[PDB]
Design a protein around this ligand. Sequence first.
Ligand SMILES: Cc1cc2nc3c(=O)[nH]c(=O)nc-3n(C[C@H](O)[C@H](O)[C@H](O)CO)c2cc1C
Ligand SMILES: Cc1cc2nc3c(=O)[nH]c(=O)nc-3n(C[C@H](O)[C@H](O)[C@H](O)CO)c2cc1C
Ligand SMILES: Cc1cc2nc3c(=O)[nH]c(=O)nc-3n(C[C@H](O)[C@H](O)[C@H](O)CO)c2cc1C
Lengths: 261, 261, 261
Amino acid sequence: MEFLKRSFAPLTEKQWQEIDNRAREIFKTQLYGRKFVDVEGPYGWEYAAHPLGEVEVLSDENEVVKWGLRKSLPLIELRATFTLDLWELDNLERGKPNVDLSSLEETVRKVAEFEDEVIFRGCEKSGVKGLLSFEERKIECGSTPKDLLEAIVRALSIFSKDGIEGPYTLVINTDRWINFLKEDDLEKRVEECLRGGKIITTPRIEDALVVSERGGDFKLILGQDLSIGYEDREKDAVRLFITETFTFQVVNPEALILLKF
Amino acid sequence: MEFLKRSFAPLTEKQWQEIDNRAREIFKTQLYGRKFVDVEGPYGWEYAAHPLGEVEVLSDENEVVKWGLRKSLPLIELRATFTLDLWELDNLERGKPNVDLSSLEETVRKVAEFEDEVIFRGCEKSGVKGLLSFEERKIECGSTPKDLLEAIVRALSIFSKDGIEGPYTLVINTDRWINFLKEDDLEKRVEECLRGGKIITTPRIEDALVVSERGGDFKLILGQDLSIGYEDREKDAVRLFITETFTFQVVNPEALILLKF
Amino acid sequence: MEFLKRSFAPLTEKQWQEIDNRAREIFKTQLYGRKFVDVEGPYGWEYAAHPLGEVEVLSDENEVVKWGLRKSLPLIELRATFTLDLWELDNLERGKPNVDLSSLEETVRKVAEFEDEVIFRGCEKSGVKGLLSFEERKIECGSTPKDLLEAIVRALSIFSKDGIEGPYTLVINTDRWINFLKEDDLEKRVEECLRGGKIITTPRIEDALVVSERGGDFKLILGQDLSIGYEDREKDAVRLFITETFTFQVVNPEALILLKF
Ligand SMILES: Cc1cc2nc3c(=O)[nH]c(=O)nc-3n(C[C@H](O)[C@H](O)[C@H](O)CO)c2cc1C
Ligand SMILES: Cc1cc2nc3c(=O)[nH]c(=O)nc-3n(C[C@H](O)[C@H](O)[C@H](O)CO)c2cc1C
Ligand SMILES: Cc1cc2nc3c(=O)[nH]c(=O)nc-3n(C[C@H](O)[C@H](O)[C@H](O)CO)c2cc1C
């Protein structure tokens, strides 16, 4: 809302709409992590920590009054700035349909990459642990297209043993998917051996993983969703920024399996 | 509520009421800090941290996406246990009006002392800073009863210069108050030079301080107010506990002055 | 109103309110002159001069048509500028309760001192004459606490002789008041010998004076009361200013007496 000083920027309503639409379009396809995780609704710009429901005991064993500190996860706040050209933006009022927004597009891609890196690999200073860090959930087979089907069947067996149900999803690297596709018609067979679930191809990881989408196993906590605001003006250009505040945690590590090729 | 397993203790409703009343009576007089600070209403047993409204920047200066962590105060949780005797408690049903509760009284005093120590001197591991730590708000005069009135007048002058108003309160040590009282009739003169405010005598500190009670300068944040619950049973006795979770902060250090005798 | 360009500053409504409240609190206690003088309501930003009701004759005595110029008091306009930091102000939106406003506080104190200097000592270029300049209203006694009561009684006698009535007020220096307070219990006796009036202690003067508060003897004429506005922005900070326009005059010099210790 008001903390994004959007009413003090020398832009009209149509120019603001153009910027918003381009950013939204790129985010919707480049945020790969949000395709299979839960999103806990925005809490506000003031939210600072998320409880973990635990106490760390700081007193000795011989005291009468024993005390400790409660534990939580601190939220991460990011900010990335870029510049736009005022004359080029003003051509939009004359009626140009294709204005130049290359700086905005480049910054949006970098922000999305940062967030996906946090989800998949974690941040040691914040204390989050990523999906690929769970090395006790890893199974191994070969690189032949038949080995992929064997691995999927074994993964579903392990899920049933642990009691996990629901739709299943395969998240795989694009280069590996193309190599598998060349050898044979993997699709329509992968889905059948995965009981009608989706396939998601990403460049973020270099192998595959299988997840259950019943709900409540991977949480992305948001304080303020991605927003665009105003900073200052530099003699012919406008400086704007993209901001967000979030954190991530894995509740049930039993709904995830890592395939190693 | 239910996390205090009070329905599983071998006690009747009258015995629970007797225990509650004795504890409440002692707390009301032994909690000295709560006589002049604000109390922010209970937030619940799940509250874990209180925001500070700040960001600590963890990235280098040459990055494109710059990030940081938001800052907060973690809550302190305490627990103190004691034992009561079942036969002695059962005499209450036969009609004894004065049952023995010495263990309960001793534990209650220790808990109150712990909380007041945190308020007046702070805890370095939690990150709270106490009232007596502000050494830039200290003024000095002598030990004569006239010097007390001079110090109070100067303190009110400093408050006016900073813009602080409202009722004023003098918090002083009991031994020093008695020594002042011996020499002359300090009261009715202290109040006049303090514009009709209160005097509070405590054994917690060894000098005096003057505070303004307009509101919103010293906050005590509570998650769960002081409560009594049940733990187990030991062959003839019942083990019970006292619990609480809280934190403290000083918003405006300009509403406080420390007198050094 | 609109001449204070407050709608062009990169601040939100909450930040404007915070600045206004701090300035108002400091002014209310640091404007000592306004505690015992009349205030003639604001006339507007365009008011320029206040009539004196007199004509100065500029022609010679042998002319047929004789003319002159009417006399008035020109208003004094002041402006003081300060700078605030934008990032520190933006922490208020994250939820910080104690933001840093040291520049604002320092400037407010200097403005109040300027106005009180004009009231008590006058400005020779504007043509105002201050309270302490009336040397024919001065009486003299000693520095003993008994001499203060004798002086107050004599002052009230002089007021009655001139016909002045109404509540009476004693305005005295803080250091002298403290020295008097040490020797004996001056208060409750000063009020009795002053027929139930107030005592005001200020650091502006170095002696005492006694005034009558019946009304209409000392006037402070305002065109525009103290206000805060916006000037410009310097790369990370905001430049703001405090402005006012006023003048002062003493109608009846017989309602004032100067005590010299
Ligand atoms: C015909 C004409 C149209 C212009 N239109 C714009 C405009 O829409 N926005 C702008 O920033 N500068 C514009 N400029 C440039 C502007 O006068 C000046 O160079 C400013 O410093 C921005 O370059 C225009 C210049 C000319 C000659
Ligand atoms: C007449 C009598 C009354 C007793 N009443 C109680 C009682 O109210 N509560 C209790 O815990 N034990 C009571 N006891 C003791 C109980 O029988 C036994 O010693 C238990 O192990 C508790 O001490 C009582 C014993 C006697 C002889
Ligand atoms: C996480 C983060 C938050 C920031 N927030 C603000 C802000 O609220 N206001 C501000 O003026 N500058 C802020 N800055 C600094 C801003 O990017 C840049 O330094 C501007 O030139 C102001 O210092 C922030 C920088 C970071 C890394």
